[PDB]
PDB file of C-alpha atoms and ligand atoms in Angstrom:
ATOM      1  CA  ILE A   1      -0.069  -0.030  -0.032  1.00 35.41           C
ATOM      2  CA  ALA A   2       1.076   3.721  -0.448  1.00 34.80           C
ATOM      3  CA  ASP A   3      -0.431   7.154  -0.458  1.00 35.18           C
ATOM      4  CA  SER A   4      -2.245   8.119  -3.630  1.00 34.94           C
ATOM      5  CA  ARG A   5      -1.822  11.851  -3.142  1.00 31.48           C
ATOM      6  CA  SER A   6       2.070  11.916  -3.246  1.00 28.62           C
ATOM      7  CA  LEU A   7       4.731  10.244  -5.558  1.00 25.34           C
ATOM      8  CA  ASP A   8       6.629   8.428  -2.647  1.00 25.03           C
ATOM      9  CA  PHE A   9       4.872   5.422  -4.164  1.00 26.59           C
ATOM     10  CA  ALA A  10       6.977   5.593  -7.083  1.00 24.98           C
ATOM     11  CA  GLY A  11      10.268   4.824  -5.219  1.00 24.65           C
ATOM     12  CA  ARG A  12       8.656   3.022  -2.464  1.00 22.20           C
ATOM     13  CA  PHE A  13       7.354   0.119  -4.479  1.00 22.22           C
ATOM     14  CA  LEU A  14      10.477   0.022  -6.946  1.00 23.85           C
ATOM     15  CA  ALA A  15      12.264  -0.483  -3.739  1.00 20.73           C
ATOM     16  CA  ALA A  16       9.855  -3.167  -2.373  1.00 20.09           C
ATOM     17  CA  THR A  17      10.083  -5.132  -5.788  1.00 21.92           C
ATOM     18  CA  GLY A  18      14.070  -4.695  -5.559  1.00 24.44           C
ATOM     19  CA  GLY A  19      13.925  -2.595  -8.718  1.00 27.29           C
ATOM     20  CA  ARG A  20      11.953  -5.102 -10.830  1.00 27.19           C
ATOM     21  CA  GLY A  21       8.948  -2.908 -10.807  1.00 31.17           C
ATOM     22  CA  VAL A  22       5.655  -4.542 -11.541  1.00 31.73           C
ATOM     23  CA  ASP A  23       4.406  -6.165 -14.832  1.00 32.49           C
ATOM     24  CA  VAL A  24       1.075  -4.074 -15.428  1.00 31.08           C
ATOM     25  CA  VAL A  25      -0.047  -0.614 -14.277  1.00 31.64           C
ATOM     26  CA  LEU A  26      -3.817   0.459 -14.311  1.00 32.43           C
ATOM     27  CA  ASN A  27      -3.992   4.216 -13.742  1.00 31.91           C
ATOM     28  CA  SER A  28      -6.720   6.667 -13.259  1.00 35.08           C
ATOM     29  CA  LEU A  29      -4.603   9.666 -11.874  1.00 34.57           C
ATOM     30  CA  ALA A  30      -3.574  12.522 -14.056  1.00 31.91           C
ATOM     31  CA  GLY A  31      -0.603  15.066 -14.116  1.00 31.18           C
ATOM     32  CA  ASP A  32       2.717  14.054 -12.921  1.00 28.29           C
ATOM     33  CA  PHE A  33       1.385  10.731 -11.697  1.00 24.54           C
ATOM     34  CA  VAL A  34       1.553   9.372 -15.289  1.00 22.75           C
ATOM     35  CA  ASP A  35       5.353   9.645 -15.502  1.00 22.86           C
ATOM     36  CA  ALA A  36       5.926   8.651 -12.010  1.00 21.85           C
ATOM     37  CA  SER A  37       4.191   5.331 -12.791  1.00 22.60           C
ATOM     38  CA  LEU A  38       5.984   4.549 -15.844  1.00 23.31           C
ATOM     39  CA  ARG A  39       8.994   4.445 -13.423  1.00 21.50           C
ATOM     40  CA  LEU A  40       7.416   1.188 -12.167  1.00 17.88           C
ATOM     41  CA  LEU A  41       8.054  -0.470 -15.425  1.00 19.79           C
ATOM     42  CA  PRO A  42      11.792  -0.624 -15.548  1.00 19.21           C
ATOM     43  CA  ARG A  43      11.590  -3.974 -17.396  1.00 17.38           C
ATOM     44  CA  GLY A  44       8.676  -2.965 -19.433  1.00 18.52           C
ATOM     45  CA  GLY A  45       5.091  -4.196 -19.764  1.00 20.42           C
ATOM     46  CA  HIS A  46       1.560  -2.938 -19.948  1.00 18.10           C
ATOM     47  CA  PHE A  47       0.633   0.569 -18.790  1.00 18.85           C
ATOM     48  CA  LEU A  48      -3.031   1.388 -19.591  1.00 19.64           C
ATOM     49  CA  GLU A  49      -4.877   4.675 -18.650  1.00 19.72           C
ATOM     50  CA  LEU A  50      -8.703   4.890 -17.607  1.00 18.06           C
ATOM     51  CA  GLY A  51      -8.212   8.893 -17.224  1.00 21.82           C
ATOM     52  CA  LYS A  52      -9.192  10.933 -20.351  1.00 21.70           C
ATOM     53  CA  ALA A  53      -7.041  13.919 -19.297  1.00 22.36           C
ATOM     54  CA  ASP A  54      -3.472  13.859 -20.419  1.00 22.81           C
ATOM     55  CA  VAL A  55      -3.813  10.982 -22.954  1.00 23.47           C
ATOM     56  CA  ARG A  56      -0.421  10.085 -24.552  1.00 23.91           C
ATOM     57  CA  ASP A  57       0.911   8.547 -27.700  1.00 26.60           C
ATOM     58  CA  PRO A  58       1.791   4.983 -27.375  1.00 25.56           C
ATOM     59  CA  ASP A  59       4.898   5.390 -29.476  1.00 26.38           C
ATOM     60  CA  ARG A  60       6.722   7.998 -27.572  1.00 26.25           C
ATOM     61  CA  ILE A  61       6.100   5.937 -24.679  1.00 26.69           C
ATOM     62  CA  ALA A  62       7.690   2.879 -26.314  1.00 26.73           C
ATOM     63  CA  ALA A  63      10.600   5.066 -27.023  1.00 28.80           C
ATOM     64  CA  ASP A  64      11.169   6.852 -23.704  1.00 30.23           C
ATOM     65  CA  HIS A  65      10.428   3.703 -21.500  1.00 30.62           C
ATOM     66  CA  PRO A  66      11.740   0.645 -23.476  1.00 32.00           C
ATOM     67  CA  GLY A  67       9.179  -2.210 -23.824  1.00 32.09           C
ATOM     68  CA  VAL A  68       6.069  -0.350 -22.512  1.00 32.45           C
ATOM     69  CA  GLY A  69       2.907  -0.649 -24.370  1.00 35.40           C
ATOM     70  CA  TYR A  70       0.728   2.165 -23.575  1.00 31.25           C
ATOM     71  CA  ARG A  71      -3.148   2.105 -24.144  1.00 30.05           C
ATOM     72  CA  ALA A  72      -5.551   4.512 -22.895  1.00 31.07           C
ATOM     73  CA  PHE A  73      -8.920   2.869 -23.063  1.00 32.64           C
ATOM     74  CA  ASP A  74     -12.570   3.012 -22.407  1.00 33.85           C
ATOM     75  CA  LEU A  75     -15.157   0.129 -21.498  1.00 35.31           C
ATOM     76  CA  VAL A  76     -17.158   1.092 -24.700  1.00 31.39           C
ATOM     77  CA  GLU A  77     -14.254  -0.006 -26.949  1.00 32.81           C
ATOM     78  CA  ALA A  78     -14.892  -3.530 -25.972  1.00 29.98           C
ATOM     79  CA  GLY A  79     -17.868  -4.059 -28.213  1.00 24.56           C
ATOM     80  CA  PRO A  80     -21.267  -5.515 -27.225  1.00 24.89           C
ATOM     81  CA  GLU A  81     -20.482  -9.033 -28.204  1.00 27.03           C
ATOM     82  CA  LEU A  82     -17.334  -9.029 -25.956  1.00 23.31           C
ATOM     83  CA  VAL A  83     -19.159  -7.586 -22.877  1.00 22.47           C
ATOM     84  CA  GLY A  84     -21.650 -10.571 -22.842  1.00 22.77           C
ATOM     85  CA  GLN A  85     -18.804 -13.007 -22.871  1.00 20.21           C
ATOM     86  CA  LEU A  86     -16.726 -11.108 -20.267  1.00 19.36           C
ATOM     87  CA  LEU A  87     -20.085 -10.603 -18.252  1.00 22.29           C
ATOM     88  CA  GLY A  88     -20.892 -14.422 -18.436  1.00 22.65           C
ATOM     89  CA  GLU A  89     -17.255 -15.109 -17.180  1.00 23.75           C
ATOM     90  CA  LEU A  90     -17.979 -12.693 -14.201  1.00 24.93           C
ATOM     91  CA  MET A  91     -21.105 -14.217 -13.163  1.00 26.55           C
ATOM     92  CA  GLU A  92     -19.632 -17.595 -13.222  1.00 29.53           C
ATOM     93  CA  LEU A  93     -17.312 -16.206 -10.465  1.00 31.00           C
ATOM     94  CA  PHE A  94     -19.807 -14.221  -8.372  1.00 30.81           C
ATOM     95  CA  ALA A  95     -21.635 -17.633  -8.212  1.00 30.12           C
ATOM     96  CA  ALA A  96     -18.327 -19.335  -7.274  1.00 32.58           C
ATOM     97  CA  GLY A  97     -18.066 -16.968  -4.081  1.00 30.49           C
ATOM     98  CA  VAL A  98     -14.724 -15.315  -5.739  1.00 27.66           C
ATOM     99  CA  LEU A  99     -16.195 -11.744  -6.300  1.00 29.96           C
ATOM    100  CA  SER A 100     -18.621  -9.780  -4.199  1.00 27.35           C
ATOM    101  CA  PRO A 101     -20.552  -6.836  -4.871  1.00 25.84           C
ATOM    102  CA  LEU A 102     -18.966  -3.525  -3.720  1.00 25.03           C
ATOM    103  CA  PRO A 103     -20.193  -1.650  -0.746  1.00 26.25           C
ATOM    104  CA  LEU A 104     -23.151   0.474  -1.763  1.00 25.25           C
ATOM    105  CA  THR A 105     -24.530   3.772  -1.143  1.00 26.74           C
ATOM    106  CA  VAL A 106     -28.142   3.550  -2.244  1.00 31.17           C
ATOM    107  CA  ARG A 107     -30.673   6.402  -2.690  1.00 29.54           C
ATOM    108  CA  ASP A 108     -34.068   6.920  -4.370  1.00 28.67           C
ATOM    109  CA  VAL A 109     -33.749   8.079  -7.861  1.00 28.04           C
ATOM    110  CA  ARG A 110     -36.037  11.084  -6.914  1.00 26.35           C
ATOM    111  CA  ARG A 111     -33.368  12.021  -4.400  1.00 27.56           C
ATOM    112  CA  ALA A 112     -30.550  11.881  -7.275  1.00 30.71           C
ATOM    113  CA  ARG A 113     -29.238  15.469  -6.755  1.00 30.48           C
ATOM    114  CA  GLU A 114     -27.999  14.662  -3.182  1.00 28.09           C
ATOM    115  CA  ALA A 115     -26.603  11.489  -4.479  1.00 29.73           C
ATOM    116  CA  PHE A 116     -24.250  13.275  -7.143  1.00 30.87           C
ATOM    117  CA  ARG A 117     -23.173  15.897  -4.411  1.00 31.90           C
ATOM    118  CA  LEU A 118     -22.052  12.848  -2.468  1.00 33.44           C
ATOM    119  CA  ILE A 119     -20.020  11.719  -5.463  1.00 32.92           C
ATOM    120  CA  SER A 120     -18.881  15.099  -6.548  1.00 34.97           C
ATOM    121  CA  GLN A 121     -17.499  15.283  -2.879  1.00 35.14           C
ATOM    122  CA  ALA A 122     -16.061  11.921  -2.741  1.00 36.76           C
ATOM    123  CA  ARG A 123     -18.127  11.309   0.215  1.00 39.73           C
ATOM    124  CA  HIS A 124     -19.770   8.054  -1.387  1.00 36.24           C
ATOM    125  CA  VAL A 125     -18.824   4.716  -0.205  1.00 37.11           C
ATOM    126  CA  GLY A 126     -17.862   2.302  -3.050  1.00 36.53           C
ATOM    127  CA  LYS A 127     -20.645   2.379  -5.647  1.00 35.73           C
ATOM    128  CA  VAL A 128     -23.677   4.669  -5.589  1.00 31.99           C
ATOM    129  CA  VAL A 129     -26.996   2.930  -6.842  1.00 34.15           C
ATOM    130  CA  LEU A 130     -30.404   4.641  -7.413  1.00 32.53           C
ATOM    131  CA  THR A 131     -33.554   2.688  -6.885  1.00 29.59           C
ATOM    132  CA  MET A 132     -36.849   3.600  -8.802  1.00 30.01           C
ATOM    133  CA  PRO A 133     -40.069   4.369  -7.176  1.00 30.46           C
ATOM    134  CA  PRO A 134     -42.519   1.513  -6.284  1.00 32.01           C
ATOM    135  CA  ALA A 135     -44.450  -0.295  -8.981  1.00 30.39           C
ATOM    136  CA  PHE A 136     -46.826  -2.917  -9.488  1.00 31.17           C
ATOM    137  CA  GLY A 137     -46.133  -5.228 -12.767  1.00 33.28           C
ATOM    138  CA  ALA A 138     -47.678  -7.866 -14.704  1.00 33.01           C
ATOM    139  CA  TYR A 139     -44.943 -10.152 -13.838  1.00 34.21           C
ATOM    140  CA  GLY A 140     -45.241 -11.710 -10.268  1.00 30.66           C
ATOM    141  CA  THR A 141     -48.013 -11.908  -7.855  1.00 33.67           C
ATOM    142  CA  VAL A 142     -49.778  -9.340  -5.984  1.00 33.50           C
ATOM    143  CA  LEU A 143     -51.145  -9.865  -2.405  1.00 27.90           C
ATOM    144  CA  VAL A 144     -54.238  -7.737  -1.303  1.00 24.92           C
ATOM    145  CA  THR A 145     -55.094  -8.642   2.388  1.00 27.27           C
ATOM    146  CA  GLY A 146     -58.727  -7.781   3.053  1.00 25.93           C
ATOM    147  CA  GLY A 147     -59.364  -7.975  -0.593  1.00 25.51           C
ATOM    148  CA  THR A 148     -63.142  -8.476   0.166  1.00 28.99           C
ATOM    149  CA  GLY A 149     -63.504  -5.010   1.469  1.00 26.97           C
ATOM    150  CA  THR A 150     -64.953  -1.827   0.704  1.00 27.11           C
ATOM    151  CA  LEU A 151     -61.758  -0.885  -1.234  1.00 25.32           C
ATOM    152  CA  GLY A 152     -59.625  -3.866  -0.906  1.00 23.79           C
ATOM    153  CA  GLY A 153     -61.686  -5.426  -3.719  1.00 26.71           C
ATOM    154  CA  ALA A 154     -62.032  -2.047  -5.472  1.00 28.74           C
ATOM    155  CA  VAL A 155     -58.079  -1.725  -5.295  1.00 25.27           C
ATOM    156  CA  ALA A 156     -57.878  -5.082  -6.926  1.00 24.64           C
ATOM    157  CA  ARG A 157     -60.146  -4.087  -9.606  1.00 24.65           C
ATOM    158  CA  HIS A 158     -57.901  -1.176 -10.188  1.00 26.69           C
ATOM    159  CA  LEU A 159     -54.598  -2.703  -9.959  1.00 30.31           C
ATOM    160  CA  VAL A 160     -55.628  -4.944 -12.679  1.00 28.67           C
ATOM    161  CA  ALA A 161     -57.370  -2.042 -14.723  1.00 30.99           C
ATOM    162  CA  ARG A 162     -54.545   0.515 -14.787  1.00 33.25           C
ATOM    163  CA  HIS A 163     -51.317  -1.109 -13.323  1.00 30.70           C
ATOM    164  CA  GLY A 164     -51.392  -4.173 -15.558  1.00 31.90           C
ATOM    165  CA  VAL A 165     -51.348  -6.644 -12.574  1.00 32.67           C
ATOM    166  CA  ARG A 166     -51.893 -10.181 -14.094  1.00 31.64           C
ATOM    167  CA  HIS A 167     -51.682 -12.458 -10.991  1.00 33.34           C
ATOM    168  CA  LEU A 168     -53.544 -11.534  -7.567  1.00 32.54           C
ATOM    169  CA  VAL A 169     -54.257 -13.323  -4.220  1.00 32.11           C
ATOM    170  CA  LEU A 170     -57.064 -11.898  -2.087  1.00 35.64           C
ATOM    171  CA  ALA A 171     -57.116 -12.767   1.551  1.00 35.60           C
ATOM    172  CA  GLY A 172     -59.304 -12.400   4.640  1.00 37.05           C
ATOM    173  CA  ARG A 173     -60.577 -14.392   7.436  1.00 37.94           C
ATOM    174  CA  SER A 174     -63.829 -15.577   5.570  1.00 39.55           C
ATOM    175  CA  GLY A 175     -62.001 -15.928   2.472  1.00 36.61           C
ATOM    176  CA  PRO A 176     -64.014 -17.356  -0.260  1.00 35.62           C
ATOM    177  CA  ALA A 177     -67.139 -17.416   2.287  1.00 34.08           C
ATOM    178  CA  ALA A 178     -67.160 -13.687   2.033  1.00 35.55           C
ATOM    179  CA  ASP A 179     -70.072 -12.285   0.027  1.00 36.76           C
ATOM    180  CA  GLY A 180     -69.316 -10.942  -3.367  1.00 36.41           C
ATOM    181  CA  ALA A 181     -66.057 -12.881  -3.287  1.00 35.05           C
ATOM    182  CA  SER A 182     -66.712 -15.381  -5.751  1.00 36.74           C
ATOM    183  CA  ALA A 183     -68.233 -12.450  -7.920  1.00 33.22           C
ATOM    184  CA  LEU A 184     -65.306 -10.288  -7.656  1.00 33.24           C
ATOM    185  CA  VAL A 185     -63.142 -13.205  -8.743  1.00 33.21           C
ATOM    186  CA  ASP A 186     -65.095 -13.765 -12.010  1.00 33.78           C
ATOM    187  CA  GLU A 187     -64.925  -9.981 -12.444  1.00 34.48           C
ATOM    188  CA  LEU A 188     -61.187  -9.889 -12.156  1.00 32.51           C
ATOM    189  CA  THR A 189     -60.608 -12.946 -14.112  1.00 30.16           C
ATOM    190  CA  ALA A 190     -62.574 -11.901 -16.937  1.00 30.24           C
ATOM    191  CA  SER A 191     -60.249  -8.693 -16.913  1.00 35.12           C
ATOM    192  CA  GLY A 192     -57.441 -11.103 -17.942  1.00 31.19           C
ATOM    193  CA  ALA A 193     -55.712 -11.613 -14.450  1.00 32.33           C
ATOM    194  CA  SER A 194     -55.189 -15.027 -12.652  1.00 32.72           C
TER     195      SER A 194
HETATM  196  N1  NAP B 201     -63.331   2.484   4.018  1.00 30.63           N
HETATM  197  C1  NAP B 201     -62.848   3.741   4.779  1.00 30.63           C
HETATM  198  O1  NAP B 201     -63.502   4.768   4.724  1.00 30.63           O
HETATM  199  C2  NAP B 201     -61.688   3.750   5.634  1.00 30.63           C
HETATM  200  C3  NAP B 201     -61.238   4.806   6.288  1.00 30.63           C
HETATM  201  C4  NAP B 201     -60.148   5.037   6.965  1.00 30.63           C
HETATM  202  C5  NAP B 201     -59.432   3.908   7.141  1.00 30.63           C
HETATM  203  N2  NAP B 201     -59.486   2.638   6.592  1.00 30.63           N
HETATM  204  C6  NAP B 201     -58.734   1.359   6.409  1.00 30.63           C
HETATM  205  O2  NAP B 201     -58.944   0.741   5.024  1.00 30.63           O
HETATM  206  C7  NAP B 201     -58.796  -0.408   4.931  1.00 30.63           C
HETATM  207  C8  NAP B 201     -59.987  -1.038   4.491  1.00 30.63           C
HETATM  208  O3  NAP B 201     -61.160  -0.672   5.306  1.00 30.63           O
HETATM  209  P1  NAP B 201     -62.726  -0.883   4.658  1.00 30.63           P
HETATM  210  O4  NAP B 201     -63.477   0.375   4.623  1.00 30.63           O
HETATM  211  O5  NAP B 201     -62.623  -1.308   3.286  1.00 30.63           O
HETATM  212  O6  NAP B 201     -63.431  -1.927   5.739  1.00 30.63           O
HETATM  213  P2  NAP B 201     -63.875  -3.500   5.381  1.00 30.63           P
HETATM  214  O7  NAP B 201     -65.033  -3.481   4.161  1.00 30.63           O
HETATM  215  O8  NAP B 201     -64.456  -4.261   6.428  1.00 30.63           O
HETATM  216  O9  NAP B 201     -62.529  -4.507   4.819  1.00 30.63           O
HETATM  217  C9  NAP B 201     -61.779  -4.867   5.903  1.00 30.63           C
HETATM  218  C10 NAP B 201     -61.202  -6.230   5.327  1.00 30.63           C
HETATM  219  O10 NAP B 201     -60.276  -6.626   6.034  1.00 30.63           O
HETATM  220  C11 NAP B 201     -60.426  -8.266   6.377  1.00 30.63           C
HETATM  221  N3  NAP B 201     -60.008  -8.499   7.746  1.00 30.63           N
HETATM  222  C12 NAP B 201     -60.260  -8.010   8.867  1.00 30.63           C
HETATM  223  N4  NAP B 201     -59.536  -8.402   9.848  1.00 30.63           N
HETATM  224  C13 NAP B 201     -58.550  -9.186   9.173  1.00 30.63           C
HETATM  225  C14 NAP B 201     -57.682 -10.238   9.558  1.00 30.63           C
HETATM  226  N5  NAP B 201     -56.970 -10.368  10.857  1.00 30.63           N
HETATM  227  N6  NAP B 201     -56.747 -10.724   8.766  1.00 30.63           N
HETATM  228  C15 NAP B 201     -57.113 -10.653   7.309  1.00 30.63           C
HETATM  229  N7  NAP B 201     -58.193 -10.005   7.074  1.00 30.63           N
HETATM  230  C16 NAP B 201     -59.003  -9.300   7.807  1.00 30.63           C
HETATM  231  C17 NAP B 201     -61.639  -8.454   6.326  1.00 30.63           C
HETATM  232  O11 NAP B 201     -62.254  -9.751   5.792  1.00 30.63           O
HETATM  233  P3  NAP B 201     -62.577 -10.939   6.910  1.00 30.63           P
HETATM  234  O12 NAP B 201     -63.482 -10.457   7.991  1.00 30.63           O
HETATM  235  O13 NAP B 201     -63.197 -12.184   6.100  1.00 30.63           O
HETATM  236  O14 NAP B 201     -61.271 -11.435   7.535  1.00 30.63           O
HETATM  237  C18 NAP B 201     -62.454  -7.182   5.418  1.00 30.63           C
HETATM  238  O15 NAP B 201     -62.533  -7.801   4.218  1.00 30.63           O
HETATM  239  C19 NAP B 201     -58.885  -0.636   6.711  1.00 30.63           C
HETATM  240  O16 NAP B 201     -57.550  -1.010   7.067  1.00 30.63           O
HETATM  241  C20 NAP B 201     -59.223   0.564   7.299  1.00 30.63           C
HETATM  242  O17 NAP B 201     -58.564   0.762   8.616  1.00 30.63           O
HETATM  243  C21 NAP B 201     -60.763   2.636   5.651  1.00 30.63           C
END
């Protein structure tokens, strides 16, 4: 480990590798950091830049730092067919217990301003995720307890009418015995919902 806000790392790690340096260097930092990092490829290797400030020419790097293939890249350069394979390979590993989702700072999308402030102040933890408003869907089941009531049944009619609900379970102590129950079922089932 070493501090990211100084350049001590550059001569701290070459000293820890005994001058061999490393074999690959993934950068996000700009400015003087770019050159200070190439110093950790004395024996050459890969050096690859995510940051889009201070992009460099692969050839004047290969010259000034023999055996260093430099490529600044963006995830879009992979192409959609490759992403699928890569994502397949990753999901294989998440399911094997090798990779774990990062720490999450979660917010409701309607509260997105504050979320971007967290991010722009570097005060988020790991990954920020925004979660959409509540919604009923035609996929999956919806439970309406007391769905033989003044409105509980009226809600059921309306969920299927304008919320697209296609699967319902109405519940109550009486259950089917409730009056208007088998009548409300036939009414909703005719509306296309199980
Ligand atoms: N309607 C209004 O103007 C109004 C106003 C304010 C608040 N609310 C609230 O809105 C909700 C619906 O009220 P509502 O006006 O439609 O009265 P409701 O017609 O009597 O419907 C209430 C439903 O809840 C069921 N129920 C009672 N106890 C239950 C239990 N332990 N477990 C499962 N189901 C139970 C009843 O079925 P079973 O007896 O067969 O179990 C009944 O079908 C209530 O929670 C009420 O507090 C309604």
